[PDB]
Each structure stands twice: as structure tokens, then as C-alpha cells.
């Protein structure tokens, strides 16, 4: 969870539409609605997919955080310099693939990306592979 | 001695034309300039070596200009982006075949280890650098004449194509090989 040698330290808000089509593992939980998603829910699902599996499982993570937070700490009258950043987030707009799987094709594998998509406040869906388009 | 080496070249190479082609004579193998670089860099101090080293190589050959700037200002010693470093001299046609056969024939075994001058692996692709020389062994002069001899360089350039187009040339001219 290092994001070291940063460019700029404070950022802005606002986002509405989104893309980034189907991926190519064996199974991946796919989003439906937009929501910010912190750097800790990702780690929670990364632990809960692993310790279900078989003391062995493999996972490909496709979501990474950039945008920083602000809090203005506890009881402050407004109107000063907005600071004090903290642990910080990513963005997933309608449809791009989170967390594709090791590929052992069982409901042994299909259950873990139900119990991982049971935190993570988005509403998800489960798919597999027949896409086979072309990119660069 | 200059025409004496001219006729040696021009009566050994038409004898030794008989391994390539016979066509387009003016398109085989020929020699070019010779650069000699003193390359001291020890006169980051006073400009006393810039006169003192400029009267023995310039007394063997043509004058010794100060192509001596340093382009940058790394650490080591505060050179002060400038000063002088290089001590280059260029030789073209006449002092060319003065200096070449003068260093080759009647002077060179004043050096030790006697393995010609070549450990046979110069590994050029283009115009074939060489040059194994530590300063003031046998040029013409008298037994010390300076303090702290500093080692010189030689870089012949040719118009050859493969490695053997100057390996065979400089070996049928002389220049003993093998380590």
C-alpha cells in the first residue's frame, strides 16, 4: 500500500460515466453502480478470498488507489486550509472488473467472490469467459 | 625516410593485392590521419604543464595545441568548468610517415616486454584504435628532461571494412601481434 514519490499532494472531486470492459481470468466480480472504494475494503476482501481457499489460492487485483482524502480534524469552524490527508481511495464507475480469480472453476472458487463481495458497498455480479475481442 | 616508406607501402601492397577482387583499386584499403592525445588532467593546478609538456611532443612532431576544456564540473577536484585538459595533436600526411616508421623501426625495442605493441585484440569495428605507450621512453631526447612522465596515446584511423581489412594490412606492414 505504498504510493511513493507522489507528484501533487491535494486533489479534487466529481465523476459520472465510466468504461473498461470484461477481463480474462476465469471469474471476476463486476460492478454495477458508482461508489468510492477505500484502501482498506480492498485489503479486507484480499484476506477473505485467501483464507477461504485451500491454503493456496491465487488472485489478480485490478483496482488501485490514487486520490487522497481530507478531514479537517474534529471540531473546527470552517474556512481554513483543508489539510491533513489520510488513507485514500480509488474509483470504479459502472462496470470494470474487480478481483479476478485463480481459475479452479468450482463453486469452491465461486463462493469466495460471493463472500468477498459482501463487504465492499458496491453491488456486484459474477461472470466468466467467452469475450475474446482485440486490443493493442 | 618519408619516400623510403612510401615506396615500401606502394611496392608491398600491389604485391599483396592478390586476395581481393582486382577491380576498383581506389576502393580497397587506405590510411588516414593520426591523433595523439596526451590526456593528462593533472594541470588542474597552475598552467606550467601547458608549456612544459608542449616542447617535447611538439619537438618530435607539429605544435601541441590546447584542445583542453572539460565540458562539466563533476566532483573529485573543483576543476572550475574550463582550464585545460587533453593536449591533442593531429598529424596528416608528412609528419604521419615521419612519426609512424620512426616509432616503429629503429626505436621501439627500447621498451621492455618486447611483445611488439599489440595484444591482438583491439576489437574495433570502424577505424581501429590501438596505442600502447607510456611517456618519454625513447623519442629523441636525453634521459630525464622532465619530472613525472605521464603516458601517451595513439589512434590510427583507416578506411577499412572488416577487422581483417586492417589486421592483414597492418601485419603485412609490420606491427607484431600476440599478447
Amino acid at each position: 500500500r505504498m504510493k511513493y514519490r507522489k507528484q501533487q499532494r491535494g486533489r479534487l472531486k466529481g465523476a459520472t460515466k465510466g468504461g473498461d470492459y470484461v477481463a480474462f481470468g476465469d471469474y471476476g466480480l463486476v460492478a454495477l453502480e458508482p461508489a468510492w472504494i477505500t484502501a482498506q475494503q480492498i485489503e479486507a476482501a484480499r484476506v477473505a478470498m485467501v483464507r477461504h481457499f485451500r491454503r493456496g489460492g491465487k488472485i489478480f487485483i485490478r483496482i488501485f488507489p490514487d486520490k487522497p482524502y481530507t478531514k479537517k480534524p474534529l471540531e473546527v469552524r470552517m474556512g481554513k486550509g483543508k489539510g491533513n490527508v489520510e488513507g485514500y481511495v480509488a474509483v470504479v464507475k459502472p462496470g470494470r472488473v474487480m478481483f479476478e480469480v485463480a481459475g479452479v472453476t468450482e463453486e469452491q472458487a465461486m463462493e469466495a467472490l460471493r463472500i468477498a463481495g459482501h463487504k465492499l458497498p458496491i453491488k456486484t455480479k459474477i461472470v466468466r469467459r467467452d469475450a475474446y475481442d482485440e486490443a493493442q | 625516410d618519408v619516400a623510403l616508406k612510401r615506396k615500401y607501402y606502394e611496392e608491398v601492397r600491389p604485391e599483396l593485392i592478390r586476395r581481393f577482387g582486382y577491380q576498383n583499386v581506389w576502393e580497397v584499403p587506405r590510411l588516414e590521419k593520426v591523433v595523439i592525445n596526451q590526456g593528462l588532467g593533472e594541470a588542474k593546478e597552475d598552467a606550467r604543464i601547458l608549456e612544459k609538456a608542449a616542447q617535447e611532443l611538439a619537438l618530435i612532431t607539429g605544435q601541441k595545441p590546447a584542445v583542453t576544456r572539460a565540458k562539466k564540473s563533476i566532483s573529485n577536484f573543483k576543476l572550475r568548468k574550463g582550464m585545460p585538459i587533453g593536449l591533442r595533436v593531429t598529424l596528416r600526411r608528412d609528419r604521419m610517415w615521419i612519426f609512424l616508421e620512426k616509432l616503429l623501426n629503429v626505436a621501439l625495442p627500447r621498451i621492455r616486454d618486447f611483445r611488439g605493441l599489440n595484444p591482438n585484440s583491439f576489437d574495433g569495428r570502424g577505424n581501429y584504435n590501438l596505442g600502447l605507450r607510456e611517456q618519454l621512453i625513447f623519442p629523441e631526447i636525453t634521459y630525464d628532461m622532465v619530472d613525472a612522465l605521464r603516458g601517451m596515446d595513439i589512434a590510427v584511423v583507416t578506411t577499412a571494412e572488416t577487422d581483417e581489412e586492417a589486421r592483414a594490412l597492418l601485419e603485412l606492414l609490420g606491427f607484431p601481434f600476440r599478447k
Binding site: 481554513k80 486550509g81 483543508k82 489539510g83 | -
Partner: protein, 80 residues
């Protein structure tokens, strides 16, 4: 900084656009381009001031053209 907010420094801005677009009969002395760096090289009958400001030199019609690799040129073509 130190532990607060140290900003709130800015400057009232110059204008520097294009003043005398295609067509538009001009007379000798009008400023055609205020710019910061050379983005429009001069042509015939167009001078170039001290800080890269183009200005008409004789009377006529401002006419834009390009060159491609070399760059955009402007020049004022005589009136009739």
C-alpha cells in the same frame, strides 16, 4: 510550509490574443498579434516588435496562411 495555509498570491493578467482577424482592412500601424513567444512568424510588409508583437507596416488586407513544417505566417496584402 509549517502547519497551516500559505497561499493567496496571484497577479492581474495581460490580454495577449489576436486583434485583427482575416479580412478587416487595416492601416499602417495597427497591432495584429500580442503574443508571448513566437507563434506567428512575420511575412512581407509585417514587422516584429521588441517583445514579439506583430504590427502592420503598409495598408491593406490581413491574410492568414500556413506552411506546415515551418509554421504559420501572417502578412498584409496591398489594397487594390
Amino acid at each position: 510550509g509549517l502547519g497551516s495555509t500559505r497561499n493567496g498570491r496571484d497577479s492581474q493578467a495581460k490580454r495577449l490574443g489576436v486583434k485583427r482577424y482575416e479580412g478587416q482592412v487595416v492601416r499602417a500601424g495597427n497591432i495584429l498579434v500580442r503574443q508571448r513567444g513566437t507563434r506567428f512568424k512575420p511575412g512581407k510588409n509585417v514587422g516584429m516588435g521588441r517583445d514579439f508583437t506583430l504590427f502592420a507596416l503598409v495598408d491593406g488586407v490581413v491574410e492568414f496562411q500556413d506552411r506546415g513544417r515551418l509554421g504559420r505566417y501572417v502578412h498584409v496584402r496591398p489594397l487594390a
